[PDB]
Amino acid sequence: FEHATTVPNVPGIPYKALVERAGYAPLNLEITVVSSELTPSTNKEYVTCKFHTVIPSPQVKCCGSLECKASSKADYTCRVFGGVYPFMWGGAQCFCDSENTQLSEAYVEFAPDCTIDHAVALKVHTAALKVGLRIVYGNTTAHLDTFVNGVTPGSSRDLKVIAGPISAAFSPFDHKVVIRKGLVYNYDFPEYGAMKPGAFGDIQASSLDATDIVARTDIRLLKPSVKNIHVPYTQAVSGYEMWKNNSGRPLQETAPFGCKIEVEPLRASNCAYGHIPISIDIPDAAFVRSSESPTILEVSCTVADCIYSADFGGSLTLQYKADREGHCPVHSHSTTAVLKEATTHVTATGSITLHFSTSSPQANFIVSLCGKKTTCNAECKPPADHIIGEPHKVDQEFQAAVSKTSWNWLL
Amino acid sequence: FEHATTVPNVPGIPYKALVERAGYAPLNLEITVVSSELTPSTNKEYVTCKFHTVIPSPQVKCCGSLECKASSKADYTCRVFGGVYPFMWGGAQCFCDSENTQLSEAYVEFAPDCTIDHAVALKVHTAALKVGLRIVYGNTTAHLDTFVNGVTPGSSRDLKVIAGPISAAFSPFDHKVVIRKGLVYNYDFPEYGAMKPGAFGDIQASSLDATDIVARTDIRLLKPSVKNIHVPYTQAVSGYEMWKNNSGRPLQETAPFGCKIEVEPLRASNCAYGHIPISIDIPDAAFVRSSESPTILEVSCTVADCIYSADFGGSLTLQYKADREGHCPVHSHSTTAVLKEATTHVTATGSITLHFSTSSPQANFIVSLCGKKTTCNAECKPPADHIIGEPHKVDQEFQAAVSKTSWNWLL
Amino acid sequence: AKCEPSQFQCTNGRCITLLWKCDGDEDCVDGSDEKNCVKKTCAESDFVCNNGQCVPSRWKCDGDPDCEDGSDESPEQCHM
Amino acid sequence: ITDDFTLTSPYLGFCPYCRHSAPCFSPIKIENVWDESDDGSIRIQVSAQFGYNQAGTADVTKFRYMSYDHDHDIKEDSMEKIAISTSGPCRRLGHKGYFLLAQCPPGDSVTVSITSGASENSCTVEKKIRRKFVGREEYLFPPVQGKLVKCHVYDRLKETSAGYITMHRPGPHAYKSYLKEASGEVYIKPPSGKNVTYECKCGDYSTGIVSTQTKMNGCTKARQCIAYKLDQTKWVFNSPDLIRHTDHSVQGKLHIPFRLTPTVCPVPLAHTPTVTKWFKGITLHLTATRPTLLTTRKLGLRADATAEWITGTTSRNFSVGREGLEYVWGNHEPVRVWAQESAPGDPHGWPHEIIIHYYHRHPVYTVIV
Amino acid sequence: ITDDFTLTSPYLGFCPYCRHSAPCFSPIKIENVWDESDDGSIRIQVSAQFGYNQAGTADVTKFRYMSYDHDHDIKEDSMEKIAISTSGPCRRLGHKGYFLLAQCPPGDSVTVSITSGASENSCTVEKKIRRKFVGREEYLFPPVQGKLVKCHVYDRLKETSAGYITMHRPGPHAYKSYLKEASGEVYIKPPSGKNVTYECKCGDYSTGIVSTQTKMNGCTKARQCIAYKLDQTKWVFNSPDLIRHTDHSVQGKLHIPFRLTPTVCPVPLAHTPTVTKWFKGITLHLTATRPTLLTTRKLGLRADATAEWITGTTSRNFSVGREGLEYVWGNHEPVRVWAQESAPGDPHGWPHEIIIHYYHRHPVYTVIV
Numbered sequence A, B: 001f002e003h004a005t006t007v008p009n010v011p012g013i014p015y016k017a018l019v020e021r022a023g024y025a026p027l028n029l030e031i032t033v034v035s036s037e038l039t040p041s042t043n044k045e046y047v048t049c050k051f052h053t054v055i056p057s058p059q060v061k062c063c064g065s066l067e068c069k070a071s072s073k074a075d076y077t078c079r080v081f082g083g084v085y086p087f088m089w090g091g092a093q094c095f096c097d098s099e100n101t102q103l104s105e106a107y108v109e110f111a112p113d114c115t116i117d118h119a120v121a122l123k124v125h126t127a128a129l130k131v132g133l134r135i136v137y138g139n140t141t142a143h144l145d146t147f148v149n150g151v152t153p154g155s156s157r158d159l160k161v162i163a164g165p166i167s168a169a170f171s172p173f174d175h176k177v178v179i180r181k182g183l184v185y186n187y188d189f190p191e192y193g194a195m196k197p198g199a200f201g202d203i204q205a206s207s208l209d210a211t212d213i214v215a216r217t218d219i220r221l222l223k224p225s226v227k228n229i230h231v232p233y234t235q236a237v238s239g240y241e242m243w244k245n246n247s248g249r250p251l252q253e254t255a256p257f258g259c260k261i262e263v264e265p266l267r268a269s270n271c272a273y274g275h276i277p278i279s280i281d282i283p284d285a286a287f288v289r290s291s292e293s294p295t296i297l298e299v300s301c302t303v304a305d306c307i308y309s310a311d312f313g314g315s316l317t318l319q320y321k322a323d324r325e326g327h328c329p330v331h332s333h334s335t336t337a338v339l340k341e342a343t344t345h346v347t348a349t350g351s352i353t354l355h356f357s358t359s360s361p362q363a364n365f366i367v368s369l370c371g372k373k374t375t376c377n378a379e380c381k382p383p384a385d386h387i388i389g390e391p392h393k394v395d396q397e398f399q400a401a402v403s404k405t406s407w408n409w410l411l
Numbered sequence C: 001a002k003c004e005p006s007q008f009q010c011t012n013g014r015c016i017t018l019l020w021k022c023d024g025d026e027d028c029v030d031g032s033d034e035k036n037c038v039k040k041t042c043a044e045s046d047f048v049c050n051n052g053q054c055v056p057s058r059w060k061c062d063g064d065p066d067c068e069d070g071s072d073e074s075p076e077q078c079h080m
Numbered sequence D, E: 001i002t003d004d005f006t007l008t009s010p011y012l013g014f015c016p017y018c019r020h021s022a023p024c025f026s027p028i029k030i031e032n033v034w035d036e037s038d039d040g041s042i043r044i045q046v047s048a049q050f051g052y053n054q055a056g057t058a059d060v061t062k063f064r065y066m067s068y069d070h071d072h073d074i075k076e077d078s079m080e081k082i083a084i085s086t087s088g089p090c091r092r093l094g095h096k097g098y099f100l101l102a103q104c105p106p107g108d109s110v111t112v113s114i115t116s117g118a119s120e121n122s123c124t125v126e127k128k129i130r131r132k133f134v135g136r137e138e139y140l141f142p143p144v145q146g147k148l149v150k151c152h153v154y155d156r157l158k159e160t161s162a163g164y165i166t167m168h169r170p171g172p173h174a175y176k177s178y179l180k181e182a183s184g185e186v187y188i189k190p191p192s193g194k195n196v197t198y199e200c201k202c203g204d205y206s207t208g209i210v211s212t213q214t215k216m217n218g219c220t221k222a223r224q225c226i227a228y229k230l231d232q233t234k235w236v237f238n239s240p241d242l243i244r245h246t247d248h249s250v251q252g253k254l255h256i257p258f259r260l261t262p263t264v265c266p267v268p269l270a271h272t273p274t275v276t277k278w279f280k281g282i283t284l285h286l287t288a289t290r291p292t293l294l295t296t297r298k299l300g301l302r303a304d305a306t307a308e309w310i311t312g313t314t315s316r317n318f319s320v321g322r323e324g325l326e327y328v329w330g331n332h333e334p335v336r337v338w339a340q341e342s343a344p345g346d347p348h349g350w351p352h353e354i355i356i357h358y359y360h361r362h363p364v365y366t367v368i369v
């Protein structure tokens, strides 16, 4: 038997619905979502850390000259100077006056401590979704975890469920994302090949242990003029540290909709937006026919003291009399009033009490105990406590959020 | 043969000119200003440095009448007290109780190490302007420096250059200027003999080693009320040091027209402003008869694509059919398109390339090769790069700065 | 030489820094920066002859005279 | 990758700031100073080996260094003569090879020094060091009780490794003391029982190996040409203060010890805020003595987050809608608070004060209707 | 002038601080502190002659002490004990007479103390000495290679006179230990072999020179008499804590050592800015790790120069015109930049691209015409 409805996508807040057939007693059906993750497909292109300039010991050729040919290591900057007379602790290192030349070079590679303190620049798009939801049918709780596209199925003990597309599709990540030390930022980093000195992305490398890295940090070798031998140089500030001092707050404490973000697969889990449509199929093992159901007649209700809030504050009393004795579901049909209870035992001439929560000042909602419908109404005062730690189980709907007395006055 | 000329006072760049007589071969003439220093007439009036308060040993008189004289030291300040009882290491320095008196004494003088940072106060007025010219003519080069006053000629071995008065007249130095450690400030120090405690000129002295130091820094003595012996005092903060704290930018980084100020004669050397018309007189020995320089026919000027800019971007080529080997001068008869070279080697039927630097969108100027006049007109585009390190050679002139297309469109 | 008044002049035409004057190292080919100063001392590990010429301690009694006279090789200090 | 030190040797650097406040040659020049820890540990690298004797047999209480004298050999000195100071004295936590580790308060320089009697120097380089904390709630000394977070701190054991250092061939080192300028002709005098080579342009090129003193043909000046020995085969790190050999290839590697490791660490928790309730709002009554981070965010399509470091005893006002907000004060767990309708005035009043209730809720949509 | 050092003597001075942090009489009283050098050096004048013997025969390792006790004489100690400090221990670079040089870190006071021995003293006087640099490009340590500018450093030789100082004859110094109070009569007694000169009033003024325990005329309390020693004639500096003599004329003149001397010194050069061009403008992609000054000024009849100390990696947009601009950066040479006329468009071709080109240039001449 097929059934379709639109459960709102809010984790932890269940909702109630019933199914009806011919010659079968209606049964309870509540679908609540326990967890919901939003995992996009990413693409890593390079990883960066702060540089560590390595200057090899300079080369001098006495009473001669030499040139230098380019190499492949990162930011290899070479330069030759003519007319130097190098000194060190043992003086007179060169037998030549203004004829010997020295050679200077200074490349760049990763620091030895940035196997932990590195940043990975990803590129995310087409964020998919999956959700785990509890389904209860005929007092037979079942656990499921399916995708969200309107194609992929999910089965567990004869429970076939199909979830439709989201009303509004979005992801909390922009096109370009960057991760360092387990927390996600949101930055517009340079592409793999456009390096700018003094900014993030100063060093590019596909892997942290790679052999052929590329970078440019505008090394400029100055001409030596001091007595002894030493190569002078000036260099721009490391882009990684400069961005680190100006990183801003992470996306952990900024993403909307209350999405909390895991970082190992770069998820975005447990946050609420839109409505997910469902299509649930139920077997016949949990359906009882009218020949075994208890018959209910002459339903009567009165409310004691109603209040509209997020917690179950309203109180309902249902007086009845039946023919047989057994278990009979009770459900509130209005979309602005849900019942805390799911099922209640029925007897000959009993009288049961219930609970409900509403979002409208008028608690005019119709309930049905095994199909015997009834109207039930009274006024509800606003609550004094206006700050709580529990989300509202029902949404605000116009034509009911305004009191009936106001309707009479303005009509 | 005299030739009155106006030369723009911009050091480094030349300005070409052509001198022509009746029946004589034209002679080239360029004038380059290489150094232009203007020296005001200074008059030192006093020097000042940080003072050093010296307090001589307090004289005591053990119950005796005691008063002080008046000396000629710097800021002498007496005060005689009553009812003291000094205690040195051996206590009870007199026998006479509560009737002995001491006199305080405190005069100021120059600091031991203020001979290196002493500030000199100068008065400057009526700055002349000395210019070192460099004139060439007929392969003959001369190096002479002249005064710019309208009368006195600074003459070389053969030349006689009466440099006339300069059009504009200004002086970066105010009426009062202070000097310290080679940096030229611009202050208004108080006159000699009228000081102010806590400002510049707190202490005055004609020579640095002079003994007639006059000062006024309101040092006041207080009555001693200590068990031991010492003379208290409260002196105002040094004016020289407090001025040094907030002296401001020197005049080496504020003077207009780009003068770099040297301090030994207090120069304002090597800047550009105004015009300095001259009156040269070339000796007749450097000329030559017109029947010796070659004559030419069929002269046409072709202008290649140019960009009007400070550098010699514009190109030019010529055609001719000469009759005799020799050297002929070349010049452009426009006031907004300076050529590049003056002398050229004219063969029988060859071609000569030239260069210029035009400031107008259209180069419709006249080129004179060895006397013959030809005109060429062309259109060429604005330059590509809009920052150069070379000053402009000619002026906008506000006349040819608009193109002929705009001319005939508006007319 | 003397390309500016803040440095030192040598007859080779080379203008060297004033900080290189009388520092125990011959800098310019003329060797003029050491001729006008009072010498510090002989080194702690050096020997002083009667003439004052510093003699390295390694060059003592190695068989070859090195000082102005040969007092480094004299038997009064390192006997044969 | 090797670990024996019998095949290597230290060298002489050129410290920018010696003990006498002037740049000079020193045997304890420090090359690099890493400060990427969390307790404040520092991995100083110098040009002298620690923990080995003259032959390199791994003795914990002896360190090597190059001598000053001209017949240069590696000498010895006791280990308890090494002191490190940045602003006050540091304390030594370990040492192996060129490297050593320390921990000392933030300053502006990193100095190591031999406090002996004969060999006594103190190299110094410029390095900016500031105290670093982990998480929020800036602190000076970690508390005895607090939540445990992830720290990355150097481990004190020398048998770790994080890095890749390279030793090269030792370059030639000529000495001016070998030469003689006796009367007119230069003499090259080798030391006692050692071989030296001369390479020089006295008229033309000439090179030879001698052990005894010789005079050189056609020479008149002692500065014309140089001499150096050939008994140097032990490897030297490619510090920029040496001369490379004729080939200068990679000829061995050594470990950089004291690797960075993940380790839990305590962190203080702040005083719990006292929340008061008002219509569509929250007034936190915050109290802290050191910079504590307070951050809030909404739960709708827009989050308009906040982030401020507070230091004194203040109070902040936040606005909470129907979707609610959360705030993470200090190191505490986040708490979510939703708001509901408590607009003054009953929706069922006999007079016409119905508007003033529907004016707080739906503030603008009630005037138009 | 004079330099005969055997006829001068130190003296006791009143010092604002002491070992126990209270004003005491100390022989290491310091008068002045001069820090007018571009190197961080200091010249200190104390009240105890350094580098001289008991008689003053120029012993390089002794210093006069001016002992405390009665029958005061002149003794010495070793100069290994003298140590001075500002915030941490600092180095002694010279000593002669009252004066001694120093090289001390920035702080807020100057301390001079005798470290060990039988007597430990100190004298801290309030003076704000702080780090100063030469030219621009504020640094922390003098670099190895830079631009050589002209400094003014103290001459650490001792035989160089920086100035001039005066000497006078010592004043009378009475003592309390020369008086006796045993009965209703007063005795005064000199030490063994010395002649005191007593003078006081009781009944009338009286004086005299005695050699033994001498009586008086008559008076009850012995607080009304004084008795100093007569046989001291060594000169004492003009200090404000000494009793003046009767005449107090300028007897002698000795030097103030450590003359300020002009010399050269290295200062660093910053990183050359990369220049980005735009129409009638310039931008400097400045980068400096320490405060560096940037000065710009135009070349027209109005200069309107600027000056600022930048300390990061910023970019400052400047506007340059037909007359040009010049900008200096740290210690670098002044570089001039002139702007030429190249506006977007074409002064030919079509009318619609002539107005645009002639609008960037002369943005008001084209409108009026």
Ligand SMILES: [Ca+2]
Pocket (backbone or CB within 6 Å): C020, C021, C022, C023, C024, C025, C026, C027, C033, C034
């Ligand atoms: Ca030298």
Ligand SMILES: [Ca+2]
Pocket (backbone or CB within 6 Å): C059, C060, C061, C062, C063, C064, C065, C066, C067, C072, C073
């Ligand atoms: Ca010998």
